[model samples]
Target: PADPEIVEGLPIPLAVAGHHQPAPFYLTADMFGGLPVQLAGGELSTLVGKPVAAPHTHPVDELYLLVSPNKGGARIEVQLDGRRHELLSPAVMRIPAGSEHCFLTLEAEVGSYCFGILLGDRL
Candidate 1:
């Protein structure tokens, strides 16, 4: 797993422009207090706002899960290599390794969230 880094607040400034942004949490191998592990994970907060992640690329593929307590209310959009893909809750998305991508929240409720899984051991 990759080294752990401390984040003071939301990674994206625009997402936090207002004070009502949903709380985001990250769970990864390192979060287990340095136990032997091989995976990294995190979640997207619930809200209608700017992009949650900045445009970036990784060496390995990444997976995303979007789920909501109620159907047809949660929504998000993802950009992969400049192509936009919009998704409703209870969906799965995979980003190819080394591809530039990012995601943004369009509509979400209190229980709406996105779980992300990095495809490599390193985060």
Candidate 2:
């Protein structure tokens, strides 16, 4: 065992992928207390017209959250289990383990962003 030391930098690093493109804070068991979960915070932007992530599947359950200060300020398209769903701000979705899914930024206003939560330790 070793003595605890002062941490002088950002513990949660940034991940640049999916709806979190360019910049997004990330956290996992590596940084936390061995909690079997992972989290990704999306960067706010006004981008549109493209899917930020390709279709994929995770071994564990996953959740998505889209947020904005006002209604209609953000829009996202979620593809899950071969079906398409269009979501506006203040929305959430749950993807069961092993289900196919993807995400796209249909529209976004300033300060509009999202978060991805993985129910496992890794992505």
Candidate 3:
């Protein structure tokens, strides 16, 4: 089986041997520099991006899927639904909507890529 194709529409710089760089964060215009768009029901659009050692939340439930495992000495702390969950590489976490959560890399020289999905239902 092949891996799924996911696009972020962001350009990443080429990496050299033994070198690494952080990803870019995408947030709404009120938070980041993203332009606002109009959605159905006359609602405002939201933005998305990648961040390093930072955390964010939205009005909808969120699911985190770790593509890469932490190479040791790195951890991701997720606080959702009044509970704290510690993840160490190759893990997944589900954060309910309106839940105040935060995540950070405890150790230096470690990195992880997380993708989010938003859910909505129509009447």
Candidate 4:
């Protein structure tokens, strides 16, 4: 059996004006948190932040699950292969990896928590 990898205090980088900014809190990956049934896998991460501009992507698949604490939430703009989709809170968005995407904060100071599961075989 493969020994499980544990990453504590994982920092989620937010893209701002083509640059990456680090979030305030620490993100830890549970050793047993990912789906074990799937083969040829990827990794999973959790993010909590105030929304910023969307970032570009490469060739990969990203699945995002939004967990916002309030009604008025943030916005996630997903640009894939020249197409765009604006995602609202309390929603689940499946983005093809390598597609361009971004996010922005909505009304009021809100908490945008997102869980991303990356699917790929190799870099």
Q: What does each candidate score in C-alpha RMSD?
A: 7.4, 4.3, 13.0, 7.5
Candidate with top TM-score is 2
In order of TM-score, best first, we have: 2, 1, 4, 3
lDDT of 4 by residue, 43-81 (tens): 112222434334656355757665556644644555555
Candidate 3 least-lDDT 10 residues: 38-47
Let me know the TM-score candidate 2 reaches against the reference structure.
0.76
Position 75, candidate 2: lDDT: 86
CA lDDT of 113 in candidate 4? 58
lDDT scores in order: 0.63, 0.72, 0.41, 0.46
- Residues 7-54, model 3: lDDT tens digits: 354433322122235323232222233324211110001111222323
| Model 4 clash tally, residue pairs | 7
How far off is residue 59 in model 4, in Å? Answer: 2.8
TM-score of each: 0.67, 0.76, 0.45, 0.51
lDDT minimum window of 10 residues, candidate 2: 2-11
Pairs with backbone N, CA or C atoms under 3 Å apart (clashes), candidate 3: 25-50, 26-48, 26-49
